[PDB]
Amino acid sequence: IDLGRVIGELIDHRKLIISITSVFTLFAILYALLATPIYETDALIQIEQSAPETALLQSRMILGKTIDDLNLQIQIEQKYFPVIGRGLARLMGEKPGNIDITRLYLPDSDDISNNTPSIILTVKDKENYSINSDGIQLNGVVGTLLNEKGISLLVNEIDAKPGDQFVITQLPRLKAISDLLKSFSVADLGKDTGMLTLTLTGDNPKRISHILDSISQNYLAQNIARQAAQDAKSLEFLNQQLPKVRAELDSAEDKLNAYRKLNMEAKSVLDQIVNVDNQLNELTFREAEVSQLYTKEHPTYKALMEKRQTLQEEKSKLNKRVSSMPSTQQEVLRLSRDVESGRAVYLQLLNRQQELNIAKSSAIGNVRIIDNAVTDPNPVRPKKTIIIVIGVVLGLIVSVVLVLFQVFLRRGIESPEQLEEIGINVYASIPISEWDTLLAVGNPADLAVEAIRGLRTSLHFAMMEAKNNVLMISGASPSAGMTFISSNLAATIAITGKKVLFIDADLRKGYAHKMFGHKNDKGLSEFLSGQAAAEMIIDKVEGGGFDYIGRGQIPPNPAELLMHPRFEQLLNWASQNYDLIIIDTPPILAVTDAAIIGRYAGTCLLVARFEKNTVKEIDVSMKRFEQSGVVVKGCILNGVVKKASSYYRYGHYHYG
Amino acid sequence: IDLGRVIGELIDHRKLIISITSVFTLFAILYALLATPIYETDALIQIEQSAPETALLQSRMILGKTIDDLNLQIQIEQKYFPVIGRGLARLMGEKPGNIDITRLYLPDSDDISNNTPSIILTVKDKENYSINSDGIQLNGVVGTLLNEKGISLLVNEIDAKPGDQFVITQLPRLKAISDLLKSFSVADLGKDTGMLTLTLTGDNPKRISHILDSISQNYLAQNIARQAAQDAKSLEFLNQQLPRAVYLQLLNRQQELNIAKSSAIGNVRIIDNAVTDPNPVRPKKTIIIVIGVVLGLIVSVVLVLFQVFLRRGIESPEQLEEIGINVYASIPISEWDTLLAVGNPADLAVEAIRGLRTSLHFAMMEAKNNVLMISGASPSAGMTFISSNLAATIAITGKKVLFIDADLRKGYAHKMFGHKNDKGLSEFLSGQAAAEMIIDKVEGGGFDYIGRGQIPPNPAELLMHPRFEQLLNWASQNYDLIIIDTPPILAVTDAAIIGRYAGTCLLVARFEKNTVKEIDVSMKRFEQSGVVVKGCILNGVVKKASSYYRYGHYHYG
Numbered sequence A: 001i002d003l004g005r006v007i008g009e010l011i012d013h014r015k016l017i018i019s020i021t022s023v024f025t026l027f028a029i030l031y032a033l034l035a036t037p038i039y040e041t042d043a044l045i046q047i048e049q050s051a052p053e054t055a056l057l058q059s060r061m062i063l064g065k066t067i068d069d070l071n072l073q074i075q076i077e078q079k080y081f082p083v084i085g086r087g088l089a090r091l092m093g094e095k096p097g098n099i100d101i102t103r104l105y106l107p108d109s110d111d112i113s114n115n116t117p118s119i120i121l122t123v124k125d126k127e128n129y130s131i132n133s134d135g136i137q138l139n140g141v142v143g144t145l146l147n148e149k150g151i152s153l154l155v156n157e158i159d160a161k162p163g164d165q166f167v168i169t170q171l172p173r174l175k176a177i178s179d180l181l182k183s184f185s186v187a188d189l190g191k192d193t194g195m196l197t198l199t200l201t202g203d204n205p206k207r208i209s210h211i212l213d214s215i216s217q218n219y220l221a222q223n224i225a226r227q228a229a230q231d232a233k234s235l236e237f238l239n240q241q242l243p244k245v246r247a248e249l250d251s252a253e254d255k256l257n258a259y260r261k262l263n264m265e266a267k268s269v270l271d272q273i274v275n276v277d278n279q280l281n282e283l284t285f286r287e288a289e290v291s292q293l294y295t296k297e298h299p300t301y302k303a304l305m306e307k308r309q310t311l312q313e314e315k316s317k318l319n320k321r322v323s324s325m326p327s328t329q330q331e332v333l334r335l336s337r338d339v340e341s342g343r344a345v346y347l348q349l350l351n352r353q354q355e356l357n358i359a360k361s362s363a364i365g366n367v368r369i370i371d372n373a374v375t376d377p378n379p380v381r382p383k384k385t386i387i388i389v390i391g392v393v394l395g396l397i398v399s400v401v402l403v404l405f406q407v408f409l410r411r412g413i414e415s416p417e418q419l420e421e422i423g424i425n426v427y428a429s430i431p432i433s434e435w436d437t438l439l440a441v442g443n444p445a446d447l448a449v450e451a452i453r454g455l456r457t458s459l460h461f462a463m464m465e466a467k468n469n470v471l472m473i474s475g476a477s478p479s480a481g482m483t484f485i486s487s488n489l490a491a492t493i494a495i496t497g498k499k500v501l502f503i504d505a506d507l508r509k510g511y512a513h514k515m516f517g518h519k520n521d522k523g524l525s526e527f528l529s530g531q532a533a534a535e536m537i538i539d540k541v542e543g544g545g546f547d548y549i550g551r552g553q554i555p556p557n558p559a560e561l562l563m564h565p566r567f568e569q570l571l572n573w574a575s576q577n578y579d580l581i582i583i584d585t586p587p588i589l590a591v592t593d594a595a596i597i598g599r600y601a602g603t604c605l606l607v608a609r610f611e612k613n614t615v616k617e618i619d620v621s622m623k624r625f626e627q628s629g630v631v632v633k634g635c636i637l638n639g640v641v642k643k644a645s646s647y648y649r650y651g652h653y654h655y656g
Numbered sequence B: 001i002d003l004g005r006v007i008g009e010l011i012d013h014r015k016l017i018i019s020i021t022s023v024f025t026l027f028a029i030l031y032a033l034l035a036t037p038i039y040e041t042d043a044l045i046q047i048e049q050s051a052p053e054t055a056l057l058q059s060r061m062i063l064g065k066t067i068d069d070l071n072l073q074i075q076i077e078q079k080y081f082p083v084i085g086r087g088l089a090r091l092m093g094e095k096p097g098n099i100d101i102t103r104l105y106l107p108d109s110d111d112i113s114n115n116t117p118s119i120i121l122t123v124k125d126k127e128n129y130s131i132n133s134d135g136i137q138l139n140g141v142v143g144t145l146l147n148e149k150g151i152s153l154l155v156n157e158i159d160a161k162p163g164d165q166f167v168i169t170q171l172p173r174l175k176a177i178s179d180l181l182k183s184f185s186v187a188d189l190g191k192d193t194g195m196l197t198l199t200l201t202g203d204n205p206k207r208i209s210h211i212l213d214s215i216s217q218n219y220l221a222q223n224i225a226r227q228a229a230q231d232a233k234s235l236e237f238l239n240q241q242l243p244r245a246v247y248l249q250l251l252n253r254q255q256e257l258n259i260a261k262s263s264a265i266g267n268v269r270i271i272d273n274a275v276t277d278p279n280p281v282r283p284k285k286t287i288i289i290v291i292g293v294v295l296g297l298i299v300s301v302v303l304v305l306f307q308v309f310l311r312r313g314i315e316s317p318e319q320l321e322e323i324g325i326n327v328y329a330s331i332p333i334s335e336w337d338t339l340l341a342v343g344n345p346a347d348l349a350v351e352a353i354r355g356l357r358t359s360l361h362f363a364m365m366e367a368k369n370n371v372l373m374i375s376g377a378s379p380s381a382g383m384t385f386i387s388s389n390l391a392a393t394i395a396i397t398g399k400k401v402l403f404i405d406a407d408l409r410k411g412y413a414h415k416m417f418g419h420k421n422d423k424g425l426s427e428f429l430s431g432q433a434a435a436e437m438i439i440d441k442v443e444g445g446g447f448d449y450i451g452r453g454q455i456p457p458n459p460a461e462l463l464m465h466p467r468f469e470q471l472l473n474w475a476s477q478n479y480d481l482i483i484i485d486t487p488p489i490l491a492v493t494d495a496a497i498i499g500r501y502a503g504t505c506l507l508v509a510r511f512e513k514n515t516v517k518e519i520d521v522s523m524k525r526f527e528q529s530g531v532v533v534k535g536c537i538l539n540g541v542v543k544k545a546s547s548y549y550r551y552g553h554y555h556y557g
């Protein structure tokens, strides 16, 4: 191949190329403009090693401590119904809403799969709101806590417009730890120094900085505990307190065994209290530790008793509910409470004993925060430019390969050279006429009619020394242009003052009578079957100037009629009253009518359609005519259009 | 391919090559002369390690301290409307202005995007100025501080000419830290030495040196505070432990801790305070210009090679003669509504046409009659030009010539000869005229002609009338030569109808427009209609250095 071919093919398929590339680039643009941006924050820590510190920072202990501090197990998502509502809302300048939640406890359905309970909160105003878990509508108010139907909720400072909806999920603690750990990274950045670089990525530019600050504070507090833990009495306090609790736990277990040897509400309110007790105990430890390493007027410490206030209020409401259930199940719950309270505290103290050991045996005495966490205002993802470039390049690659397949899979004719290589004379090339009437009469100045005049002058020289004045037009496949060519050629030969007869011998799908204006009675069939004479079948074209014979009524045995000798009698009679006779026939590959007629025709031409037919089809038609004893003079290419890749140039342009 | 061909192609396209390369080089010059210069300053620090000190130097605490000290959060820009105003103003040697601002507070609009409040200050004199936020015009004066509409401002020492405008931005502290960081670099250069090279690049040759000095001072004063502290912690502990030999022992230890606190010089030492290299490091003008010139050359050469491989027109008669087509002449462009063979009888094109005339005088013997038909493949190839001038030159030799304009669709011969447009060829063929009212005399010629007449609606069908052959037979007895001009053969079929009665037929191929394919198709289409084409005439030739086919198209006399 050569570059001229490929350039021509590209120019010809430019519309497809442009469409595909535009679609791919549009998809890339929309993706890069709708993807939620991802911000990144960092901090710098000074270590007085650093590999065990790297391992310890990403441990479940410290991250879990941070989550318990910041209530990261409460997931809040602004609701947009489509997969693109969020992006457009950001683009429209709409301010994303947020709600501050300080207490959430769902009834914890805890089925086989959905371990994460979730509810939907709809904003009604700046004060009240609606809540639905499974369609059950409840109304709540900012400020006052809600304790209904095994659902505990505390909403503060709703910042949104009315009508907004938010999904509230209570995801499990380990899930929150895993989510935090996925997006959190630690590095040394020097491979030897006491410098640690902490990095965190997330979609909220403020939340991630707060989280990273909390992580740094927790780690520093853990190491600063080391220096003060050796002389601390908490070690001896825990060493003595733990055996006492275990006996209480064991005694609680033993009592529970004696009473044993399932009310839904009673079980739920039991879970209500146990959750409250857990938060109260851990907060009590947290308040102690914060009071030691921080001050009371610190906002963190101010947060502590406020949450402690809420927990006591929730417990008070729970006990009032417990006061309302019958004592029969109350005894079971009180036994159930103590066992779980014992287990929870025993678990809590075991960590406390473990954590206190963690402080003491720490080789790195001094840990310093050089740079507190800040967030880079430029999002790190998505990287818009690379996405757009990849989209454009992908569009170009797929367009080019698609064009190469379409080029390599075409087999139709493209230029008369393909036919002339085989040894077939092409007598004309007719272009597509963009214009049920004769073209050679409606628009005599059309390009196609000019090409047909060229064909007329070719024939006037070819059809000399022919055995008679009968010309047959046929073709390989239907809808190639046989009737079009034949009728228009008849018109153009008629306008020069010669008597022309057009015979529509397509006894299967002929419609020439429609295109000429007709008296459909007494066509060719009626003559061939013997029930008409030769004079009632000939009609005059109105806008033409030549006579015609229509097919007539469709017979059931077309090919058998054409073999009757009356057909040759008709041709011999007509050949003395007309200067030219043009016969239209069905395709030769489909049926055999053309080969029957061709015995009586002095000249025979095939019509090959430009892009549809193949060289093989035309060769096969040539040979099939040969076998039946019909000599084909040549071919006529029809329906040509301008192709830049052709590099073969017709005169199909207006001159006048 | 060979070297001669490519050299010729470059010689021929030299105009395009020079134009493209010069444009690229001009843009390179403009960029290298208008880009804002960037200066670079450096300093050298000695470390008494060196891996964590790099990270501590680029920390937000030290850079933030520097920014707070030198107020890097007040950004001042001289205003030039275009992306080239600053560069041009520098080129005329105009001194940029500067303003000292020591206190600034904007209302902090802080919308979703524009977190950076800004104002525009227009200097009116050495003392007063106008301030606009969003059209809110205020007047301020150097010295007195301003607090109006939630804007606090203090300007000192305006150094500019009146009428200048300055954009004043109060960017957030973190943005200033990031901006400082991106232009600040630290390297070790020894991988073990206590040597650190600090580098800072910026547009102001003095401001960057001040900033780097401030950074070094902050880092150094921070470092000694670390060593002094651990001594100070030890000194504080000993003082707090004071309750007589032990009493003197602690006092002596206290003095040792006092002297160790004051003798601060420690791990960090400033070898070289920052200085600025006066030659800007960017833009690197020479490499920019070299890249521009090379890019121009490469794109020009690729464009020329592209055009060469996509060229398809005829270039020399050898291309036609390979196929087996006799080329009887080659006519060049005549750079000179009149017959060329009369206006400028000594033109080069008329010389080539005389060569064609002598070729014909030998080709047209043994022709069945004395009729010559000139046709072509595509329109505006030169058929009318060639036919008319050939008639003129053959007429000046004393032979009777008849010129027929059988282009019944767009023939304009009557215009070019001076006309009585009535009774053309159409009127004769349709039967509404006789053979004698149609023949007209050319004034500056010497031959008769027949114009087309009125454009008919059925040109090709008229030409089939036997009256046309009657006219030719009659005229062939009263003239020595008959020339017939015809429409192209690819467009319409008129030429192939006419060619039945012509003894000789020639094609005209236009030099670069037509290709060999059209000429071959035209020959074959003439053959199918029973018309034998004698040969071809190449028209419109111009000099190509790449040709290596070389004509007699030069003056001799």
Ligand SMILES: Nc1ncnc2c1ncn2[C@@H]1O[C@H](COP(=O)(O)OP(=O)(O)O)[C@@H](O)[C@H]1O
Pocket (backbone or CB within 6 Å): A430, A431, A432, A433, A434, A448, A475, A477, A478, A479, A480, A481, A482, A483, A484, A485, A638, A639, A640
């Ligand atoms: N060059 C052409 N320009 C415009 N229409 C054409 C051309 N060739 C064929 N056609 C139209 O396409 C249709 C199929 O051609 P037709 O000859 O009637 O069928 P068939 O070849 O099977 O006998 C017809 O409507 C015809 O008018």
Ligand SMILES: Nc1ncnc2c1ncn2[C@@H]1O[C@H](COP(=O)(O)OP(=O)(O)O)[C@@H](O)[C@H]1O
Pocket (backbone or CB within 6 Å): B331, B332, B333, B334, B335, B349, B376, B378, B379, B380, B381, B382, B383, B384, B385, B386, B539, B540, B541
């Ligand atoms: N070698 C030439 N030098 C100068 N002008 C030419 C030359 N060949 C053709 N032309 C001019 O360019 C125009 C196109 O030629 P023309 O013969 O009129 O078209 P056509 O061949 O279709 O009849 C004409 O105006 C002609 O005078």
Ligand SMILES: [Mg+2]
Pocket (backbone or CB within 6 Å): A482, A483, A506, A510, A584, A585
């Ligand atoms: Mg048909």
Ligand SMILES: [Mg+2]
Pocket (backbone or CB within 6 Å): B383, B384, B407, B411, B485, B486
């Ligand atoms: Mg002309």
